[PDB]
Design a protein around this ligand. Structure first.
Ligand code: X04
Lengths: 374, 368
């Protein structure tokens, strides 16, 4: 792409050009794509979530609801603010289950301030229901769309349903800046407050004056330049990820289940995932609340053997995310379970999904998988 | 000069993050280096790994940038601020007094080396050692500075360097956490990548951060380290030129004997005499405080701005900042006096002696 070209322009024009010109352009390109009105380029999606929580008014001991089936980077900002996470198990989309969300809210001893909703592997959550539940309960909806840039629900970009949304451009996301994040949101004033926090909470004057404290979270111009170049190819990459998924479905569909995107949504299929020896009747095996304690989850025998066999042929595959309600870090925290995120870990595999792959590459990988599983 | 070359290599395909850490170890002689997305992040990890918890006391330089002390706030610890001496850094007598009067043992000291100048290290290191205080050096502006031929940042249990200055948006970015203890630095490294246990799936005993430096900025860091020493020598030449041209009207306080300040920014004081130092000894409960610049300084800044030349006041001390209202500060008047009479001069390494001559002529004209 134009990554090297833009980086060179940053170095050449640094002396003369508007401050942060490529950061500004990156924010513009994300506004153009997502149709959000406000965009703030930051050094990570974790930083964007942290600022979203702080500007939303989350304080020590407030309650924040969150997805259990996620990467801990989505929920660590709850801990930064010394707020208390409440975790919710997932549905057939991999995302927060609607019934469990309702249950969790109703059983909260204190009214939750916010929900961080992950769109996992780029799949859309059930937005109509979840947006309505948050609205009715006065809960700030923060979308963790870190892996979901290029995903849509009913023709609207994931990330634009909440008061805040976050995208990531870390090294392995559909598109990358070698590290970066974007905070988007509905409220200009809130996003501008985040922008103020992102550069050490400086008052508008000649010397350094501070009424509050902030962070060093602002994206650099060099990474902003990569971000511009990456946004130029985002749509082509989303189409190619989806092609790759459809090819895996074609080759592996006899043995693996490929759960559908919600009707009238468009998952970016950032990583192709599949479930071995799975039937939908295994879903929702329970409905319960726990206080978290650490547990291991045994991978289905065919999945651990597959990862091992492929690793020996220099092909990287990975288990799915290990649910937060099984992690020692969150010992003592409340979680609402239905069995689904543990089941998906047991039977799931994350497949090579790089957009440079041809149909033959996906076929060669798939044949090795089929040979492994027998 | 190698920035683009190295970025191109990155794109052809964390080699450069590893190389950046190695180049800092090669330069500083520290045994341990961890590249992170900012110096603030580095200070945050140093405090957490030092064992600082909510309501612990952390001692810190008053005359500094808030980026150096904001991590005390992140951990909900309590800062105690200390005024400076003739080096611009923490005064040794105030430091001892602050420690003596602390209601409970302070866990750590964040010591800034302001504008590159070395603090009085023999004394400060001994004071922290005698009192069981973890010394964290904020050497964000002091990469290339030395004290008795030992690199600033390598005296503390932890030291921190920064890469690109303080504009609200920079071309590149990055910080480096160095330190004496391999296990402590590796624990910071663990925290810097979301506190993952060593296994195939994601397992977490604790929570961490996304603070690891990107490979693209690591490439730039390696290129910057390759030219660091040449830049330091140029900075020191520029400082000497300003001193030559302006030394009749401005005081250019000496670096400590047998130290080397990187002179990363040239600074000077107008209408200043040493007998003005240590004028106003007290401690306070912090309140916001406005400090009027000396009229020759405020006028200098505007005059040069109008000739399209950028200069700035010195750092405005933390003990004068609303954010730290209520916190304790030990004072002797120096950092407020330096703010009043001080100016930060253009210090770009591309300037020639004639450029510094010309800027100085404009300076002298403005002040008479
Ligand atoms: C004295 C001093 N200390 C610190 N910690 C910093 C912060 O660096 P960074 O801007 O990479 O967070 C700066 C700004 O680079 C500084 O001048």
């Amino acid at each position: 792409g134009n990554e090297l070209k833009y980086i060179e322009e940053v170095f050449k024009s640094n002396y003369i050009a508007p401050l942060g010109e490529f950061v500004n352009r990156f924010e513009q390109s994300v506004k153009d794509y997502s149709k959000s009105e406000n965009a703030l380029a930051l050094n990570s999606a974790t930083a964007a979530l942290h600022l979203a929580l702080r500007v939303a008014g989350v304080k020590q001991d407030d309650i924040v609801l969150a997805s259990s089936f996620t990467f801990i980077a989505s929920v660590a900002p709850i801990c930064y603010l010394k707020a208390k996470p409440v975790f919710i198990d997932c549905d057939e989309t991999y995302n927060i289950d609607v019934d469990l969300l309702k249950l969790a809210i109703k059983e909260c001893e204190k009214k939750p301030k916010a929900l961080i909703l992950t769109h996992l592997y780029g799949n859309a959550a059930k937005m109509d229901e979840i947006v309505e539940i948050c609205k009715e309960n006065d809960i700030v909806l923060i979308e963790d769309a870190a892996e979901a840039l290029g995903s849509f629900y009913k023709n609207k970009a994931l990330g634009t349903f909440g008061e805040f949304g976050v995208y990531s451009y870390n090294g392995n996301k559909i598109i990358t800046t070698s590290g970066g994040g974007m905070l988007i949101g509905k409220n200009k004033e809130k996003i501008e407050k985040a922008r103020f926090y992102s550069t050490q909470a400086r008052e508008n004057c000649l010397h350094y004056e501070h009424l509050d404290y902030g962070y060093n979270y602002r994206l650099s111009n060099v990474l902003g330049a990569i971000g511009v170049a990456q946004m130029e190819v985002l749509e082509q990459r989303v189409l190619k990820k989806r092609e790759i998924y459809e090819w895996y479905k074609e080759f592996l569909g006899e043995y693996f289940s490929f759960l559908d995107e919600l009707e009238n949504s468009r998952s970016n299929r950032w990583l192709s995932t599949a479930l071995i020896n799975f039937d939908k009747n295994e879903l929702n095996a329970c409905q319960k609340d726990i206080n978290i304690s650490q547990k291991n989850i045994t991978l289905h025998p065919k999945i651990s053997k597959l990862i091992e066999d492929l690793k020996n042929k220099q092909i990287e595959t990975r288990p799915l995310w290990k649910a937060m309600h099984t992690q020692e870090v969150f010992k003592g925290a409340k979680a609402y379970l239905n069995g689904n995120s543990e089941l998906f870990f047991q039977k799931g595999i994350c497949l090579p999904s790089g957009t440079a792959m041809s149909k033959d590459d996906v076929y060669e990988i798939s044949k090795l998988i089929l040979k492994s599983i027998k």
